[PDB]
Design an enzyme around this catalytic site. Sequence first.
Site, PDB file in Angstrom:
ATOM      1  N   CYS A 118       5.285  -2.045   0.135  1.00 46.70           N
ATOM      2  CA  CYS A 118       4.437  -0.902   0.447  1.00 46.70           C
ATOM      3  C   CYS A 118       3.883  -0.928   1.860  1.00 46.70           C
ATOM      4  O   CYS A 118       3.089  -1.793   2.212  1.00 46.70           O
ATOM      5  CB  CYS A 118       3.278  -0.777  -0.554  1.00 46.70           C
ATOM      6  N   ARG A 121      -0.393  -0.268   2.596  1.00 44.10           N
ATOM      7  CA  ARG A 121      -1.427  -1.195   2.201  1.00 44.10           C
ATOM      8  C   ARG A 121      -2.713  -1.308   2.971  1.00 44.10           C
ATOM      9  O   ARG A 121      -3.627  -1.946   2.495  1.00 44.10           O
ATOM     10  CB  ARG A 121      -0.831  -2.547   1.937  1.00 44.10           C
ATOM     11  N   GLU A 295      10.159   9.757   3.612  1.00 43.15           N
ATOM     12  CA  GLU A 295      10.582   9.663   2.217  1.00 43.15           C
ATOM     13  C   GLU A 295      11.252  10.976   1.824  1.00 43.15           C
ATOM     14  O   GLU A 295      12.295  10.983   1.165  1.00 43.15           O
ATOM     15  CB  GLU A 295       9.373   9.421   1.314  1.00 43.15           C
TER      16      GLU A 295
HETATM   17  C1  HEM Z   1      -2.375   4.999   0.503  1.00 43.47           C
HETATM   18  C2  HEM Z   1      -1.148   5.867   0.790  1.00 43.47           C
HETATM   19  C3  HEM Z   1       0.222   5.219   0.496  1.00 43.47           C
HETATM   20  C4  HEM Z   1       1.364   5.357   1.231  1.00 43.47           C
HETATM   21  C5  HEM Z   1       1.580   6.166   2.515  1.00 43.47           C
HETATM   22  C6  HEM Z   1       2.403   4.606   0.572  1.00 43.47           C
HETATM   23  C7  HEM Z   1       3.707   4.559   1.016  1.00 43.47           C
HETATM   24  C8  HEM Z   1       4.747   3.899   0.458  1.00 43.47           C
HETATM   25  C9  HEM Z   1       6.118   3.945   0.876  1.00 43.47           C
HETATM   26  C10 HEM Z   1       6.603   4.782   2.054  1.00 43.47           C
HETATM   27  C11 HEM Z   1       6.830   3.167   0.033  1.00 43.47           C
HETATM   28  C12 HEM Z   1       8.327   2.886   0.010  1.00 43.47           C
HETATM   29  C13 HEM Z   1       8.892   3.349  -1.352  1.00 43.47           C
HETATM   30  C14 HEM Z   1      10.256   4.051  -1.330  1.00 43.47           C
HETATM   31  O1  HEM Z   1      10.778   4.342  -0.249  1.00 43.47           O
HETATM   32  O2  HEM Z   1      10.760   4.278  -2.500  1.00 43.47           O
HETATM   33  C15 HEM Z   1       5.905   2.594  -0.921  1.00 43.47           C
HETATM   34  C16 HEM Z   1       6.203   1.717  -1.937  1.00 43.47           C
HETATM   35  C17 HEM Z   1       5.297   1.198  -2.838  1.00 43.47           C
HETATM   36  N1  HEM Z   1       3.934   1.526  -2.880  1.00 43.47           N
HETATM   37 FE1  HEM Z   1       2.860   2.465  -1.456  1.00 43.47          FE
HETATM   38  N2  HEM Z   1       1.882   3.987  -0.558  1.00 43.47           N
HETATM   39  C18 HEM Z   1       0.545   4.363  -0.638  1.00 43.47           C
HETATM   40  C19 HEM Z   1      -0.291   3.958  -1.681  1.00 43.47           C
HETATM   41  C20 HEM Z   1       0.053   3.080  -2.707  1.00 43.47           C
HETATM   42  C21 HEM Z   1      -0.842   2.660  -3.820  1.00 43.47           C
HETATM   43  C22 HEM Z   1      -2.283   3.180  -3.999  1.00 43.47           C
HETATM   44  C23 HEM Z   1      -0.148   1.768  -4.558  1.00 43.47           C
HETATM   45  C24 HEM Z   1      -0.529   0.968  -5.826  1.00 43.47           C
HETATM   46  C25 HEM Z   1      -1.948   1.196  -6.343  1.00 43.47           C
HETATM   47  C26 HEM Z   1       1.152   1.649  -3.957  1.00 43.47           C
HETATM   48  C27 HEM Z   1       2.167   0.875  -4.431  1.00 43.47           C
HETATM   49  C28 HEM Z   1       3.439   0.801  -3.967  1.00 43.47           C
HETATM   50  C29 HEM Z   1       4.483   0.007  -4.569  1.00 43.47           C
HETATM   51  C30 HEM Z   1       4.291  -0.913  -5.796  1.00 43.47           C
HETATM   52  C31 HEM Z   1       5.623   0.260  -3.884  1.00 43.47           C
HETATM   53  C32 HEM Z   1       6.994  -0.299  -4.179  1.00 43.47           C
HETATM   54  C33 HEM Z   1       7.674   0.810  -5.016  1.00 43.47           C
HETATM   55  C34 HEM Z   1       9.075   0.522  -5.460  1.00 43.47           C
HETATM   56  O3  HEM Z   1       9.360  -0.670  -5.703  1.00 43.47           O
HETATM   57  O4  HEM Z   1       9.849   1.479  -5.577  1.00 43.47           O
HETATM   58  N3  HEM Z   1       1.257   2.462  -2.837  1.00 43.47           N
HETATM   59  N4  HEM Z   1       4.660   3.067  -0.641  1.00 43.47           N
END
Ligand code: HEM
Lengths: 420, 420
Positions: A118, A121, A295
């Site tokens: 992610c 973070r 994305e």
């Molecule tokens: C605060 C704004 C946030 C942004 C801009 C963001 C952005 C992203 C991006 C760009 C990815 C790559 C996933 C892909 O391309 O499929 C990702 C993955 C991920 N995010 Fe964040 N995220 C945010 C908040 C969060 C929150 C609040 C959580 C958990 C409470 C979280 C958990 C995750 C996890 C677990 C992944 C890995 C997902 C996977 O394995 O497909 N994200 N996120």
Amino acid sequence: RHVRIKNWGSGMTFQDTLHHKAKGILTCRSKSCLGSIMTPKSLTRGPRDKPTPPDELLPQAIEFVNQYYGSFKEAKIEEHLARVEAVTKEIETTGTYQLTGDELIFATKQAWRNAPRCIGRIQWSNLQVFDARSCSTAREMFEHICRHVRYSTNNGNIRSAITVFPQRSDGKHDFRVWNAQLIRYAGYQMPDGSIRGDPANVEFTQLCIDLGWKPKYGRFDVVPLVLQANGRDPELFEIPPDLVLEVAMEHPKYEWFRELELKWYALPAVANMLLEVGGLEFPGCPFNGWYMGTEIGVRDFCDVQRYNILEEVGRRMGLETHKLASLWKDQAVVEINIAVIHSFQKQNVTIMDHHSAAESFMKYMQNEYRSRGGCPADWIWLVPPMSGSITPVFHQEMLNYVLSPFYYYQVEAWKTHVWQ
Amino acid sequence: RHVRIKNWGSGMTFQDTLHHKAKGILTCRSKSCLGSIMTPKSLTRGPRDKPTPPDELLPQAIEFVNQYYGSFKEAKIEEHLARVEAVTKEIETTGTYQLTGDELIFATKQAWRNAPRCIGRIQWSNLQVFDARSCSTAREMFEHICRHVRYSTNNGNIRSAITVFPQRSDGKHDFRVWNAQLIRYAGYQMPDGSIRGDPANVEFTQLCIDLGWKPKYGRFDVVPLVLQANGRDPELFEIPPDLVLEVAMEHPKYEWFRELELKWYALPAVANMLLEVGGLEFPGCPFNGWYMGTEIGVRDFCDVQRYNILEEVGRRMGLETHKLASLWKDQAVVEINIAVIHSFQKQNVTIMDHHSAAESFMKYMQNEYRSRGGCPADWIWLVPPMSGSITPVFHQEMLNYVLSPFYYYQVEAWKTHVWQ
Ligand code: HEM
Ligand code: HEM
Ligand SMILES: C[C@H](O)[C@H](O)[C@H]1CNC2=NC(N)=NC(=O)C2=N1
Ligand SMILES: C[C@H](O)[C@H](O)[C@H]1CNc2nc(N)[nH]c(=O)c2N1
Ligand SMILES: [Zn+2]
């Protein structure tokens, strides 16, 4: 015994000791690195048949408690001892234990921090935790989910939130959202074999259809929620359209872009992952953040196995679509991405460009090494799928390890579900 | 066991068995993946003081002979086993051994084939091998290299070739090129505090000045070759200007691109790596291929620690360079790369774009799995610095591992050289 990592663009180095706390689960060996594997079973937490034996659960519960109390700036040694005793007994009495509401809030934010793929973070502390562990029915799940959706959508000023459903007991009564995302468009195999809508979603849309949903055969039909409450067979519920904010795609110089008739939803929400905390598994914990333009602009719109509009866009821009060397694909993907960025902003919906995002992650990474001497990161997922080396992240060496609490994948529910 | 990997953009999967023959030297543990480390010690083959213990040498020697002889469709056990016998005696008597001319041709190509970070590998069977294991002096090394540069530059029609200098004996008589590349521009720390030329070469450039080279203080001054013969202090030799083909940078529509007054050299040659073959180490083996446009356009011209022209180009392009969300950096990097491939084409110099290169690599990866049930690949290196997911390589899962023969890194000569 830290591991030094360096950023070849800034010269900055970090010493990593945190990885010593990681679980010995990754599949990499001296003989081979399997770091580019997407869904390894090492990052997957699959279905249970029995409850976790209490003795086995005890050590992990205490570790989480020690970790929870360890986050205290002003240590509560006394409260700490108490809680450890309380948990030991609760497990002794009930074979399990319940996280206080504060331990859950902490656990959710920490699992986000421990999420190596992610890039968002830096926002880890800004997370709304909807406690839905009281849940018992599919309808109730539906309502909690609509509350989350309305909360997070917040009229465009997107906010992060997580809805935690009841923890896994024996694994025969799991509360899970079968959907990968809360909001996702349908994909249909037309009678001639072709596909309409999101091709990645064909299989699941069929499940929905098989469960009674009426297919609308459109390009962007929000699929229904397939909710499993208490291990019972799942039930369909459609998110009321008024709770589904969407953005029409326009391009700031290209009038004809609008003719493509494209749009995408505002809420990115992962709904099928499992939260692991002190030995406890939470099979239902949908979470959301806001979008990173790439994305949609690169993956959703340009992947060949998705919407695949590159060819058509290159053609409309008047590019030398015939030869790879003209770099027409690279000019198209940028304009499409400009459209996405421009449209969300136009409609006043939260979205971050990949440059600002990467710059925010570098800031977060430094803070992490400063605070806990470590930041598990997966280079392969963090680096944007467009303009890689243009981002600071590309030039950053990283260490990838699984800590706890952690957000693991699960085996797709329909693959394991015995219908009754 | 095999390891199944898959391409998510095509659906193709491979079953890797070759990884078992890899050397157990990667630092990835179950508790951590450090595949993003750029110059790991696991990929480095450093200095020596004693000859290789023959007992350690013999097995690797035999393995190689077996591999070599096993490479013929038309087997020859008589010849093969005799060569095993011969090599045994040789090591028993001499404490080392010598490859044949054909064996060396096989080793160099096979090492290239086993080069995980190389996107050009489909060409692996087209490599001109300049045998120079008889070399004995710095001027002689310089002469072999000038021959190599001339053969490869081939008037713009670039050809791949490697020059093998004498194998390491006791680690005290290493034949080595100190320079990372054969041709490379200098970086000067100007008096006003600025850097002129290639900033990443300021240190090596000062080394040259320390050895007596006259700094020319230009933006694209080829540095002198710094050649070490038989372990002696290195001696400087400047490549004849006429032997250095360069390409002036111009953009097909942006007439002002010429005002930037940039240019780059046509021949890319890694000059400082070590060829490992059956226990033998060849600290001197400069090799070359042709350029993949992105190396120059995105890396050399756009890295902030290199020429870093992104800002002025964006400005010249009239972009909202003040706002990251405008994706101005993305528009500018695309045009820079179009100038690169345009200019090389216009001057009739061999260059390959990243889509075409990525496409050929996929073709090569499949042949490899059909051929040996494996293909060591470093995802992080193989995915172009720009437009990652637009290329098929991004969607491809890989296994990275170290086979034999192999091209390793070395500790930069100066960091270890005892000046006599
Ligand atoms: C605060 C704004 C946030 C942004 C801009 C963001 C952005 C992203 C991006 C760009 C990815 C790559 C996933 C892909 O391309 O499929 C990702 C993955 C991920 N995010 Fe964040 N995220 C945010 C908040 C969060 C929150 C609040 C959580 C958990 C409470 C979280 C958990 C995750 C996890 C677990 C992944 C890995 C997902 C996977 O394995 O497909 N994200 N996120
Ligand atoms: C045939 C045309 C070739 C092309 C287009 C090509 C292209 C590339 C590219 C783009 C890289 C990544 C380098 C970077 O960005 O730092 C690379 C790395 C590499 N190439 Fe190839 N290459 C070619 C031929 C060869 C040959 C003939 C050999 C060996 C005889 C070779 C050996 C390597 C090695 C060992 C690396 C790793 C370099 C490092 O660790 O810095 N390449 N090549
Ligand atoms: C930190 C990170 O490993 C480095 O920045 C890597 C990433 N991938 C890379 N890939 C290629 N081809 N060349 C590099 O110099 C390079 N640098
Ligand atoms: C095979 C490879 O691991 C796969 O294509 C990865 C690469 N990096 C990624 N990075 C992000 N953010 N999202 C993805 O889906 C992927 N896919
Ligand atoms: Zn690894």
